[PDB]
Design a binder for this molecule. Structure first.
Ligand SMILES: Cn1cc(Cl)c(C(=O)NC2CCCC2)n1
Length: 480
């Protein structure tokens, strides 16, 4: 890594210096590093130029605004300080070149939208890896190769993706936040494909801003949910985009590429998805629950088809797609009720989970849940209300009561119900789960909400070892 090489595309006669790492933070700027002095959140990194020089950085690239001309080469205490106008915009490109263009050395897929980003990301990474890729994800959960994921500027994005390339990643599924897009955090990334899940006088400027940004990015293949209203607005202007639907929104007059679920059967262990596409028709057996997750799976399918993965191979491997751990995660066993573990711990999330669960439920829908102690009490009656309305049987129990009287939390939940008396109450979460699962009929569904993947119950100050997943698994006679 050389300052001259790094800046060649922009600054013709830049000094030759060996560079170690690239950083925005003067406090971690070691000897040999490239320090990047940016202006932003009422904060100016050019303040910390002498600090960095004193800490022995090899060179500095700084914002030119008010201080210098674009590409102006100065030197301070033997250290090259090079000024670039609108450095915030160019940071991704700068970092990209520094880290040897990671997105040009793997198949990168960006997923944007409000919901389904994490699930769609994980499905893409999974399915691609099942077809021979070494796949990775970068998202809200975290970054890493599939299985080794662990918990943010334009430089960090390029640097992390470079790390995944070094680890042998050939495919990466990236969650692209709306916020990050507006702040040029992915401005210079070569996306093989961009996916849109959903959105949930003014409308003109918002759309204009988004359209403007789109034209500035290398989005690659566009894969869009046509069941979303903004999705169809995108599709109207993008004749090469792939339209995906499960609610009869493909308009075949356009003669574009498409994928639509024709019929879907939500059953006790997942969904059977019959679909047609411009790549051909087929039937997928998904082990994921709810309509939203069919949509996510169809988006991932359409995306991989668009990138040239063969339909027959994707079909062969579809059954092996798993859900995100503790996200509408189904547990079935011969002759026993279906049990779904979900982390839903807010009113809206609980409602979604129950509505999702209902689709797979021939018999009665049971909801086992509680609320956290020593936390905002406002949600408690709201979650009670939702449990009452959208489930047939509400089993109110404990969920991290902490120092707060467990029964006090339950009472707050019950307060929200029209008919608290028809709710079952059982303290001991384990016992309550056991109660729902044991009493439920074969064609019933038990949603165990609130914890999902978490493997602890906080009673008092103790963090006791407990898992919904393990409890459910033992009762059903399977492994979590
Ligand atoms: C600026 N930019 C980068 C990405 Cl990625 C997107 C995006 O939102 N793409 C979705 C709408 C058009 C196709 C899918 N926009």
């Amino acid at each position: 890594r050389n300052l001259r090489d790094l800046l060649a595309p922009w600054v013709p006669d830049a000094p030759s210096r060996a560079l170690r790492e690239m950083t925005l933070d003067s406090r971690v700027a070691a000897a040999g590093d490239l320090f990047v002095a940016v202006v932003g959140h009422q904060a100016d990194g050019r303040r910390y130029i002498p600090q960095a020089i004193a800490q022995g950085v090899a060179a500095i690239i700084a914002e030119a605004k008010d201080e210098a001309t674009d590409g102006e080469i100065r030197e301070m205490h033997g250290v090259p300080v090079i000024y670039l106008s609108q450095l915030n915009e160019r940071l991704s490109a700068l970092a990209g070149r520094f880290y040897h263009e990671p997105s040009d050395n793997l198949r990168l897929v960006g997923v944007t939208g409000t919901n389904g980003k994490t699930t769609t990301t994980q499905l893409l990474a999974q399915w691609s890896q099942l077809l021979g890729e070494i796949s990775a994800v970068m998202g809200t959960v975290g970054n890493g190769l599939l299985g080794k994921v662990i918990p943010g500027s334009a430089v960090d994005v390029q640097h992390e993706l470079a790390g995944l390339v070094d680890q042998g990643a050939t495919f990466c599924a990236m969650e692209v936040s709306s916020h990050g897009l507006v702040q040029h955090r992915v401005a210079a990334l070569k996306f093989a494909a961009s996916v849109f899940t959903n959105l949930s006088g003014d409308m003109e400027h918002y759309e204009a801003a988004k359209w403007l940004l789109y034209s500035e990015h290398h989005c690659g293949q566009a894969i869009i949910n046509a069941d979303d209203e903004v999705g169809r607005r995108w599709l109207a202007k993008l004749p090469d985009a792939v339209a995906v639907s499960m609610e009869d929104h493909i308009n075949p007059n356009c003669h574009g590429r498409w994928l639509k679920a024709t019929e879907v059967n939500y059953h006790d262990s997942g969904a059977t998805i019959r679909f047609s596409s411009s790549w051909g028709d087929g039937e997928i057996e998904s082990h994921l629950m709810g309509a939203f997750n069919v949509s996510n799976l169809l988006l991932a399918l359409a995306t991989l088809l668009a990138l040239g993965y063969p339909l027959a191979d994707l079909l062969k491997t579809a059954a092996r797609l798993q859900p995100v751990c503790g996200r509408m995660e189904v547990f079935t066993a011969p002759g026993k009720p279906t049990v779904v573990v979900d982390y839903a711990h807010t009113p809206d999330a609980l409602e979604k989970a129950l509505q999702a669960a209902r689709l797979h439920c021939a018999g009665k829908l049971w909801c086992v849940f509680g609320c956290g102690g020593d936390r905002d009490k406002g949600k408690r009656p709201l979650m009670g209300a939702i449990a009452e309305e959208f489930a047939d049987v509400a089993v109110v129990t404990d969920d991290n009561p902490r120092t707060e009287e467990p029964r006090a939390i339950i009472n707050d939940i019950l307060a929200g119900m029209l008919d608290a008396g028809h709710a079952k109450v059982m303290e001991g979460r384990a016992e309550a789960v056991t109660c729902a699962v044991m009493q439920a009929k074969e064609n019933d569904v038990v949603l165990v909400a609130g914890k999902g993947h978490e493997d602890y119950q906080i009673v008092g100050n103790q963090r006791l070892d407990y898992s919904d997943r393990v409890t459910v698994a033992r009762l059903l006679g399977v492994i979590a």
